[PDB]
C-alpha cells in the first residue's frame, strides 16, 4: 500500500531479505537516524530558470524518505554556500547512528562541474565533483566511514548532444 | 591504539549524462534522469543493489531519441553490495 | 537510413588507486593491483561479471597496511552485465 | 588443466553458462577475432625505472590471452605515441568481428593522468584518461559500438599515501 511510510517503493519481504559478507550492514530500524541532503538550484542570476525543478524536489524527497532517510532540502545556493552546507551536513551527529547517506545535486551544469546561483561565463561559480567527495570522505567525515555514500547529480556535463549517426 | 583507514571508500556517484554531454529536463514533467531513477528505485530497491539498479537506469536510456543522454556511474569505491532492504 | 547512437557507452575503467593517491609496485613481484586483478579474474571470471569481479578486488584492499591503495571503477556506461564465459 | 588455452583461469561450464537480455552477447568462438592492447612504460628519461614491470606485462598478457584476446604489447611510449597507438588500435578491422576489448595502461602517474616516457615536472608528457575514452568511443571507434570496452590502469593518481588514522 502507498499509504505507508515506504509509499510507492516496492517492499522487500522477509523471505526476499534472507535470500539476499558481501553486503553493507543495515542498522536497526528503531534506533537508526538516516540522513539525506538535496541541493537544488532553480533560480539563477544569469542562467535561465530551471522550470520543473519542483517536480524533481518532490520526487526525490518522497523517495529518499520512503527508503528511510530524513531529507534536508536546500535551494538556490552559490558554490560557496553549497560547500558550507556540505560541510555542515558532514558534521551532523545523526550520521554516527546511520548506516548510509544520499546526496542529491540538481542544477545547470558544465564540463567543470555543477553551477551555483551566481554562475556566468565571465564570473564562474562552479562546484566540482572532486570537492563533494573530499567533504564526505573519511578525513572530513569520519562518521560515515565504511558506510555507502551515494551521490546523485542532475546536470549537463557540457554542451554536446551526445550522439553519433550510423547507417543500417 | 590508532589504525589506518582508506581516505576514500564506499562512494558511488550517478550522473545524468556522460562528460561533455547534455542532460534533459521537461518543464512540467521534471528531469528525465530523476524521474527514471525514482521509477527504477521504486521497482528494484527490493530485489537489486544500487550498482545494478543504476545499470538498469542506463539501459532504459539505450535507444536514443531527439533528446538523448547516457547516465554515468563515477568514482566507485563500494567494496560491498548496497541493498536498501525497503520495509526493514 | 541513419540512426542515432550514444557517443559514449559500454565503457568501464578500473584504476589502481583513488584520485590524489598512490599505487604500489613490488620491484620483483610486480604491481599489487595487477597481481590482485589477475588472481581475481582467474577465480571469478567463470561465475561473476566484470563489475562484480572489480568490486571483489576493491574488497581485497579493504584492510590497509604500510602500503595502502583503493582501486577505483570510473566512468561506467555498461548497460548490461559483461560475463567473460571463459572456455566458450 | 593449465596446459590449455585458458591456462589458470577457472573454466565456466555449460551448466554454469545456462544458469547465467541483461548480458552482453558473446560471438562464436570459431569466427571471433578478440583484440586487446597493453601499453607499459618501464624505461623513462627523468623518472626512475619501473622495476617489476616485466612481471606485470607477462601476467596481463597471459591472462588476456586466456580469456580469448589477441594481445598487442607496446613499451616505453610518449603521450603522443600512445595517442597514435590507440588511434591505430581503434582502426583495427578485427574489432568488427569481436565482441569486446581490453585496454591496459601501466606507467608512472600523476593526478592529471598517465606519464609518457619523456615526462618531467618542467616538460610534462601526460596522457589523460579523457583522451583514451574519446579515441575508443562510438565516434572515433564505430567498430566497438555496443561492445564492452574495459580499461585497466596501473599508475599513481597523485602523491598522497591515501590513508587516515582512527582510534579503537
From Swiss-Prot, chains A, D:
The active site is at 108, 156. There is a cross-link at residue 10 (Glycyl lysine isopeptide (Lys-Gly) (interchain with G-Cter in ubiquitin)). Heterotetramer that consists of two anti-parallel arranged heterodimers, each one formed by a 20 kDa (Caspase-1 subunit p20) and a 10 kDa (Caspase-1 subunit p10) subunit. Can form a heterodimer with isoform epsilon which then has an inhibitory effect. This is Caspase-1 subunit p20. It comes from Homo sapiens (Human). The gene is CASP1. The chain holds residues 125 to 297 of 404 of the full protein.
Amino acid at each position: 500500500t502507498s499509504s505507508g511510510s515506504e509509499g510507492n517503493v516496492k517492499l522487500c519481504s522477509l523471505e526476499e531479505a534472507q535470500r539476499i559478507a558481501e553486503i553493507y550492514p543495515i542498522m536497526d530500524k528503531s534506533s537508526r537516524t538516516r540522513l539525506a541532503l538535496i541541493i537544488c538550484n532553480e533560480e539563477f542570476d544569469s542562467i535561465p530558470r530551471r522550470t520543473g525543478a519542483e517536480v524533481d524536489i518532490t520526487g526525490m524527497t518522497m523517495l529518499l524518505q520512503n527508503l528511510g532517510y530524513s531529507v534536508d532540502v536546500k535551494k538556490n545556493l552559490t558554490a560557496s554556500d553549497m560547500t558550507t552546507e556540505l560541510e555542515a551536513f558532514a558534521h551532523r551527529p545523526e550520521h554516527k547512528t546511520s548506516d548510509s547517506t544520499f546526496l542529491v545535486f540538481m542544477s545547470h551544469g558544465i564540463r567543470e562541474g555543477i553551477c551555483g546561483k551566481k554562475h556566468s561565463e565571465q564570473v564562474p561559480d562552479i562546484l566540482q565533483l572532486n570537492a563533494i567527495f573530499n567533504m564526505l570522505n573519511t578525513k572530513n567525515c569520519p562518521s560515515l566511514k565504511d558506510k555507502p555514500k551515494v551521490i546523485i547529480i542532475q546536470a549537463c556535463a557540457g554542451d554536446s548532444p551526445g550522439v553519433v549517426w550510423f547507417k543500417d | 591504539a590508532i589504525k589506518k583507514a582508506h581516505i576514500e571508500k564506499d562512494f558511488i556517484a550517478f550522473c545524468s549524462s556522460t562528460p561533455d554531454n547534455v542532460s534533459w529536463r521537461h518543464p512540467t514533467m521534471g528531469s528525465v534522469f530523476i524521474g527514471r531513477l525514482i521509477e527504477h528505485m521504486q521497482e528494484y530497491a527490493c530485489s537489486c543493489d544500487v550498482e545494478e539498479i543504476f545499470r538498469k537506469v542506463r539501459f532504459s536510456f539505450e535507444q536514443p531519441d531527439g533528446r538523448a543522454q547516457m547516465p554515468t556511474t563515477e568514482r566507485v569505491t563500494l567494496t560491498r553490495c548496497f541493498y536498501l532492504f525497503p520495509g526493514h
